[PDB]
């Protein structure tokens, strides 16, 4: 099987073979046939009476663990713990953002750059704004956001875009969210030996936990990031490994937390550091981003995107990365080993993510700019250790357009609003094109890479099929970066891949057929958008012809995302089977009974063409239900 559809990826894999270094593909091959029990989710290790493995085939072999737990119980608890872990990752990201908001000041390193956005958020949090200092408002907003994480009395605060009907449905179902850390703790408590042994209740607890990710953690992280670093607008950038410069210092930012990458971008324009880069013999400083931190700095500043998850190692294989600065999440620990074969400084900066044999330079949030300058100076000084004979940068990079926040999308939609009719600054043109049938629907393509799928193949095939069927596509994360590398994030792509209705819409609004809405936490934006559409049409989000796809997901964060997208009322297709096939009841809940609960359900489909067909059929049947 081919390892990737990306030619630059293939060239660097040949180079890695020539250099005698191992990749994620090599380790996947070394793992050989993976354990069937773990793959089906019928293995349990929740107590030291175990490990227990029960048969993935009902009626045969061992039926219960030592405590008496069935295959359905073991599967449901394993799934719930994946959701809890994903929720924890996203919530910790949002908590750091809220703490940064709490420390903003007029003369400090972290300021308020979008005051209108802050005032609207303050309105959503019942924070007074009129005749008040902007930083007093910011601190009050940060306090309310922080209380969302750990309040023990009262109800949490949810964005106004969430329909009232969806909230009432959640309350009736028993999944209405509480404080984020409280829900994570509840899931961890109920999976403990001898607690919850009922699959339906376990799945409902996991949905309840995932809601605190989708609508509170990721949402607050995104909106506070907009407040502090600016709301994204349409902006040009370049993507894929070709963005590395042979004659410049190459600094690659990998990870998820945006404050460090924002401070690194600011430090790169420091005159002393630019002079130092010139003095070490480089033309300048070339900042490139990877994964979600790359998505953030690219959405807000046009920083070039070096690559997505399964390309991180190959970035080092070029031999041109002088510094690789990482914060947390989706940072392959093998990088520490791999950087030994090159001059690259692999720099960890977060106390949450220590990696053995990496260079640890703790990013100081109290003095973010000075700390970022010190880290960047280490990366620049490493340019003297470059071995130019080992350098091979593929001449493969692609132009991309991104920055499509909800605000930017609304601004673009204002173009097709007749001034004599109005209203302006709404999602009404999008609702109109969806209701009329010019657009069949909207689909979110999100998720990681996975060695189980030819890298980027499923993302590209799913996106092309959807836009060919007049389904407008919004992309986040590594899927968005796969689209960027391929060339879908271009206005020209409208006439090259889209169907007639979507091509007309793209021409009228002057947008690409695929809209890059940011990082994984920025999936909250997608929720926001859908909610607005629903609130404009007076229906629940489960009545709309919308869907989400995770063609190549790998992370626990992806599991939590799919869970809260389904719980919000949006059908979700998974291109990689989650470890639930061992529990028939869990499969039936996720793919059949969930529709009775929340009006949406999971679809497991490993063939992208079949997934596109199923998405189109499901959207059409929801349209016929809605009468459009």
């Amino acid at each position: 099987k081919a390892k990737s559809i990306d030619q630059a990826t293939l060239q660097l894999l040949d180079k890695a073979k020539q250099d005698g270094v191992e990749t994620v593909w090599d380790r996947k091959a070394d793992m050989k046939v993976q354990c069937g029990f773990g793959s089906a989710g019928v293995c349990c290790r929740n107590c030291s009476m175990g490990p227990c493995r029960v048969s993935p085939v009902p009626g045969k072999g061992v039926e219960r663990g030592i405590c008496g737990a069935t295959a359905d119980v073991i599967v449901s608890r394993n799934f719930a713990r994946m959701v809890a872990a994903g929720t924890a990752a996203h919530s910790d990201h949002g908590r750091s953002i809220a703490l940064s908001l709490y420390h903003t000041s007029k003369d400090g390193d972290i300021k308020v750059k979008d005051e209108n956005k802050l005032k609207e958020v303050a309105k959503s949090f019942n924070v007074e704004t009129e005749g008040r200092d902007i930083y007093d408002i910011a601190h009050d907003v940060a306090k309310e956001g922080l209380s969302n994480y750990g309040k023990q009395l009262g109800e949490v605060t949810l964005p106004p875009s969430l329909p009232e009907k969806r909230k009432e449905l959640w309350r009736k179902l028993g999944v209405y969210p509480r404080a984020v850390d409280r829900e994570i703790a509840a899931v961890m408590h109920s999976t403990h030996i001898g607690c919850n042994a009922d699959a339906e209740a376990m799945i409902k607890m996991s949905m309840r936990c995932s809601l605190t990710d989708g609508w509170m953690g990721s949402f607050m992280g995104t909106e506070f990031s907009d407040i502090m670093f600016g709301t994204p607008h349409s902006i040009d950038t370049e993507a894929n490994l070709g963005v590395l410069e042979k004659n410049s210092v190459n600094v690659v930012l990998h990870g998820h937390e945006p404050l460090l990458s924002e401070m690194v971008v600011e430090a790169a324009s420091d005159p002393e550091l630019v002079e130092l880069a010139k003095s070490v013999g480089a033309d300048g400083i070339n900042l490139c981003g990877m994964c979600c931190t790359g998505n953030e700095v690219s959405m807000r500043h046009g920083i070039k995107i070096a690559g997505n998850f399964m390309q991180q190692e190959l970035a080092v294989v070029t031999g041109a990365v002088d510094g690789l600065i990482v914060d947390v999440q989706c940072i392959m620990p093998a990088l520490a080993k791999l950087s030994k074969s090159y001059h690259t400084k692999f720099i960890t900066t977060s106390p949450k993510a220590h990696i053995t044999d990496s260079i640890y330079m703790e990013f100081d949030e109290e003095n973010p700019l000075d700390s970022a300058k010190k880290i960047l100076k280490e990366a620049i000084l490493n340019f003297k250790n470059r071995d130019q004979s080992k350098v091979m940068i593929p001449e493969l990079k692609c132009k991309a357009i991104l920055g499509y926040s909800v605000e930017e999308i609304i601004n673009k939609l204002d173009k097709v609003v007749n001034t004599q009719i109005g209203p302006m600054q709404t999602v009404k043109p999008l609702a109109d094109v969806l209701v009329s049938g010019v657009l069949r629907g909207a689909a979110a393509v999100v998720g990681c890479n996975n060695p189980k799928v030819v890298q980027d193949s499923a993302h590209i095939e799913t996106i092309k099929g959807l836009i060919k069927n007049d389904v407008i596509v919004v992309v986040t994360g590594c899927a968005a970066q796969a689209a960027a590398k391929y060339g879908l994030l271009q206005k020209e792509a409208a006439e090259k891949y889209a169907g007639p209705g979507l091509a007309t819409v793209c021409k009228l609004v002057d947008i690409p057929p695929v809209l890059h809405m940011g990082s994984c936490v920025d999936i909250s934006r997608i929720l926001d958008l859908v909610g607005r559409v629903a609130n404009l049409l007076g229906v629940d989000m489960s009545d709309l012809p919308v869907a989400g796809v995770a063609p190549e997901w790998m992370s626990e964060k992806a599991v939590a995302i799919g869970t809260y997208v389904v719980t919000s009322g949006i059908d979700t297709w998974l291109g990689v089977a989650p470890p639930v096939t061992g529990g028939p009841e869990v499969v039936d809940i996720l793919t059949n009974k969930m529709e009775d609960w929340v009006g949406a359900k999971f679809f497991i489909e490993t063939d992208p063409h079949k997934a596109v067909e199923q998405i189109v059929n499901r959207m059409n049947e929801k349209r016929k239900k809605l009468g459009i």
Binding site: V416, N418, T419, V435, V438, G499
Partner: protein, 290 residues
Amino acid sequence: MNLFQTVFTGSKQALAAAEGIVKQAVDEKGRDYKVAFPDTAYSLPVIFAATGKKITNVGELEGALDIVRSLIVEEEMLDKLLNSGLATAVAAEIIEAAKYVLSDAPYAEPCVGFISDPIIRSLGVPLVTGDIPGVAVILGECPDSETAAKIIKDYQSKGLLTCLVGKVIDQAIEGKVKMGLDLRVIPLGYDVTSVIHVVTIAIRAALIFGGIKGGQLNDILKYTAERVPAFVNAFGPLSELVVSAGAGAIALGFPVLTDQVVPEVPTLLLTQKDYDKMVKTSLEARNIKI
């Protein structure tokens, strides 16, 4: 019934009416009997633009229903909707041709029916010059004669060439609107199919001024969209046939504005209840400068 289904239903009704009237013409006059429009050089302009074929006898008119049949594909995608609008336009043209071959004088005053080529050439000079900054196709009935007269005279005072289809003709007559080719208020006919008589004005504008040869349908549609500043104001309740004819106008690149609640399409299908702002809304939608 959604927009696509409404357009498909309208196109099927137009096809049924065309089949009935063609059967009547075949029964009364014979398949060798001549089929023509008064003083034109492009036979039936819509069929000539779509295929290049000139319809000369009744048998060929009966064979032209296959064009309407092939232009109706009931799949909910935008291209099929535009093709279905074009099917309605072809069916309306066939109905008008059958009217002309059945009756010696199908239209009486003030209705003018078909517009001859010399009138098109006369209007071409002020069209490109800018003395005619647009073509207002008014179809249906306004709630009052006063509002219809007000809108029509507002268009007239701005130099636009306004064409009238339906009961709006009677409302304008009650409103003391002075009509004629020099007064730029042209009543086409009381039936919806009479709207084709302004559609052929645009089509022949591509045939005469644009120089596009017959059968180059995409070139004709591009020319009408980028050169002919026409728009539709549909007043009063809209049947499926009216919506299908509006889909044809959209296929020609002409935006359709109405006072009725319809599934809106930005820049193409717009609802404007306020009759005091309909003229400005249409001028903005068609990008017309006075």
